[PDB]
Structure formats: C-alpha cells, structure tokens
Enzyme design. Structure first.
Site: not given
Ligand SMILES: *c1cc(=O)[nH]c(=O)n1[C@@H]1O[C@H](COP(=O)(O)O)[C@@H](O)[C@H]1O
Ligand SMILES: *c1cc(=O)[nH]c(=O)n1[C@@H]1O[C@H](COP(=O)(O)O)[C@@H](O)[C@H]1O
Lengths: 257, 257
Positions: B90, B92, B95
């Site tokens: 999970d 999630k 990026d």
């Molecule tokens: C995160 C959020 C977003 O909206 N845009 C992004 O690019 N990122 C992170 O920023 C870094 C950009 O790297 P580069 O494209 O300049 O190499 C990268 O680490 C990405 O995870």
């Molecule tokens: C992820 C997405 C979402 O919409 N809701 C979530 O609860 N989660 C993940 O699922 C697990 C829920 O656990 P519990 O509340 O039954 O203990 C948890 O791992 C959360 O990260």
C-alpha cells in the site's frame, strides 16, 4: 507589494523553519533547491558538499538510495549545517493521518529525525496534515502542501488547488508553504517551491514538464526553484548549480523592482 | 448480471494477477484483505501465518517496519505461497513517472521484487502509471488506482474519481482495479478494494471513517474489504478475521444470486 526574503523572514505569523530558510536565502543569495535524485550515498554526499554553498535546500528521495543508513543522514546533516541549507524529504505523503504519522516518524528511514521539511498531498483531506503534525510539531519541523503538480494530466487544479490553500491556512503552525507551479496564495508568510524547472523548455518521456527559472520565479511569482536532472545530468554539477542559482536569484530581484 | 469471482477470473480481458486473485477468493471463500499495520517483522510474519487461511490478500506498509530486511519479505512470500494469498504493498505512489519508477524498483525496499500488487494516486496524471508499468509489466505485477479515499475531507470525488476510472481503462495491461469506497466501474474485469471497514460504526481521531462489510460489499458493490485495526486490535485476531471473512463473503453471495 513584494517584500524581500529578509523582510518576509520577520513577518509576524512566520514559521521559524520558513524564517530560518528565508534568512539563509538572503545571506547566500540563492533560491535554488537541489533535487538530489541519485541512488548512491557517496554521490549524494559529494553533491551536497560541493553544491552546498549554491543552494538554500537539498531535496532527497531516500526511498531511492540503494545504500541508505542513518549514518548517511548524519553526514548529510553535518553538510547542511556547515554549508547552511535545509534538508527537504520529498516523501509526498498521501495516506490517512494514522498511517502517515508512522511513515514520518518510524520504519527504517525515521524521516522526522533528519528532515527539516516534508511535503504532503491534500487528497486524503486534512487528516493527513493532522497526522504529520503530531510528529512534526514536537520536533519543530515544517510541511509543504502539494497545491499543484508539474506533470502532464495533473489533477491538482481548480477546486483542488483551492482546497490545498485553505488547508495550509488552517494548519499554519506546521504548514510553511506549497509545492506549486505558481503563486497560489497571496499571504507572504507562505513559501512557494516549484519543481518542473530547466533552462531549456521541454519535458521528459514520462510526463514531466519544464519551465524556465525566469518564467517560474519572475512571471509566475514562485519563491524557490527545485532542480533535479537539469543539474544532476551535467558533467560539472557545480557550474550547472551556479547557472540555475543566478537565473533564479536575478528573476527574484527583477520581480522585486 | 453479476458474475461470480470464478467466472470473472476467466474473462477475456482479465489481467493474470486479477485472475489469480479471483480464483483463490472463490477457492477459499474469502474476499478479506488483512491490513497488517504492525511495526515488527515477527508480528507481520506471525499474523500472515495465523490468518493466511482466512484472507485473499495481505496488505503491507513496509515503510513502517522498524526491522525490515528483504529476508522478512522472502519469509512473507513463503507464507503467501503456502496459505495462498497475494501480497499488496500500500505504497500509494504520488509523484511523477520518472521518480515512482525508481521508488517501485529500487532503494532498500525493492517493492516490485515481492509485491504482487501496488497502488497509485492519479493526481500526477497518467505518467504515474506509465512509470510504474515500466517496472511492473516485466515483473508480471498489477496496480490499483486510488479512485476514492475513506478519510474525512477526501478530494477523490466527482471528476477526480472519473479521471481515475478513465486512466485505469486506458492502462488495462497493468491496472487491475481500484481502491474505492464503492463500485466505480461497471467493467467486471476490474477489482474494487475498499479500506475504511469495521463491523461497528465510527472512525479514528485522524480522519478515518468506517463502514460495514455489508454496506461496502452488498450495498455499494465493492469486491474486497481491507481491514486493519478492526482485526489487529482485537483480542483474538483469528476469530476477528473469521468474522470479517464471513461478513464480506455472505454480502458478496447475496449480491450474486
Ligand atoms: C514532485 C512534484 C511535482 O509536482 N513535480 C516534481 O517534479 N516532483 C519531484 O521533483 C523532482 C523534479 O526533478 P527533475 O524533473 O528536475 O529531475 C523529482 O524528484 C520529482 O519527484
Ligand atoms: C488507504 C486509502 C484509503 O482510502 N483508506 C485507507 O485506510 N488506506 C489505508 O488502509 C488501511 C486502513 O486500516 P484501518 O483503518 O482498518 O486500520 C491503512 O493501512 C491505511 O493506510
């Protein structure tokens, strides 16, 4: 109208992490955040050491480091203090509050023990910020909310972006600003950090889009450019970092009047 | 007209991972995914062994394991193969394509080496899926897209949810379903897994909301319930897992005919 970084650092409602950052930005004349997207600890540390003087912040993806240990993070902390930059873990938390609290505090990475800043997506609702803050506040950390993304097809638009701004305002004890492509908030206490930046326009072949420092800082009104491959992919990363620092800084000056 | 899990397992456009899962759900009479939110490797392994017979799937948060090693995951796979359940990390992902690819394949966790399934948020746009699939397809993996969230104030609603469904349909080679609170697609090839599940009404103090298995499966049309604390916090986790299995399974049978 436009206040300098040094003046913003003294705003009444300003977070001490934002204030510390704005001060070193002013002192060093850099609004460049290095995105240190490398898989080797030795490369990460050699980048942080060499480029430390040119940057206000070092952004890490520790979950990409093949040889992560907490000792690597300790050496990174030494470089951050010696060269004066903040450490930003680009974790992009996007889970319920109960889970993100453990992901931030615990596990192998213990992000909260070494990262001045982390970021979070707002898609889960405000519980994501409430979970993180239960860990971050005690440790005097800050958080950025992802109001906009740089990639093609991003759904972080319109009402979504507005929700991010609203959530930041409601948790300003912990939230210091945004990941966005522009100024999304009129309040100068908030910092705007913009990824998706390169000198040449274009993108990659997995949906990244690039705009120039001048466009992002100068016309879009953001504060800090986040630059990964634009620097990392150069033969001489120091020269590259300086090119980006100068472009971002001068665009900031020229926005200031 | 609703097809049984065994019939769905045979659909022409079924993903092999979905097929394997549908087959064992029918064979074991379980549509319960255990959310094994624990901080110790021995606790994860213990629960996996004891509850394996009752579950179709074991959902992991590796980044919360204080003592993760790839050896723990080898041990986990052994239990998965023995008791016949899928491993779902999970993570999630939230990026850009270029980054998630590295976060999926690399780092300390090597998620793709052991996770039959992962999930991704759709907020970055479809590049998040293209990046993951570059690693996932060669390794014969599947992905779930987060179409709705269980937490208060969630922004995964309306057009966001419709974007998620659209992205899934357009990447059916790799995407096998959704994390959602209800059926979001009428296509029977897609799986719907629902977290935020407990027998009793309520939530936590960090924005989680609970609905019952009969509500989630019978009335809202989901396939699989994801249950963490409702099982883990119980004195007898085996009896608790059996209660959730029987609840989800009967609700499925009623909806069927
Ligand atoms: C995160 C959020 C977003 O909206 N845009 C992004 O690019 N990122 C992170 O920023 C870094 C950009 O790297 P580069 O494209 O300049 O190499 C990268 O680490 C990405 O995870
Ligand atoms: C992820 C997405 C979402 O919409 N809701 C979530 O609860 N989660 C993940 O699922 C697990 C829920 O656990 P519990 O509340 O039954 O203990 C948890 O791992 C959360 O990260």
């Amino acid at each position: 109208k436009e206040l300098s970084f040094g003046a913003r650092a003294e705003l009444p409602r300003i977070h001490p992490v934002a204030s510390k950052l704005l001060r070193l930005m002013q002192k060093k004349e850099t609004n460049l955040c290095l995105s240190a997207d490398v898989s080797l600890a030795r490369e990460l540390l050699q980048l942080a050491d060499a480029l430390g003087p040119s940057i206000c912040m070092l952004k890490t993806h520790v979950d990409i480091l093949n040889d992560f240990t907490l000792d690597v993070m300790k050496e990174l902390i030494t470089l951050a203090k010696c060269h004066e930059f903040l450490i930003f873990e680009d974790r992009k938390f996007a889970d319920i509050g109960n889970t993100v609290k453990k992901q931030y505090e615990g596990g192998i990475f213990k992000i909260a023990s070494w990262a001045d800043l982390v970021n979070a997506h707002v898609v889960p609702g405000s519980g994501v910020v409430k979970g993180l803050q239960e860990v971050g506040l005690p440790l005097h950390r800050g958080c950025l909310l992802i109001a906009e993304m740089s990639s093609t097809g991003s759904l972080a638009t319109g009402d979504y972006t507005r929700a991010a701004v609203r959530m930041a305002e409601e948790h300003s004890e912990f939230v210091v600003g945004f990941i966005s492509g522009s100024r999304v908030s009129m309040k100068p206490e908030f910092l705007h950090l913009t990824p998706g930046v390169q000198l040449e326009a274009g993108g990659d072949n997995l949906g990244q889009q690039y705009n120039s420092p001048q466009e992002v800082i100068g016309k879009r009104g953001s504060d800090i450019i986040i630059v990964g491959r634009g620097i990392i992919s150069a033969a001489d990363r120091l020269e590259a970092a300086e090119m980006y620092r100068k472009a971002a800084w001068e665009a900031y000056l020229s926005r200031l009047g």
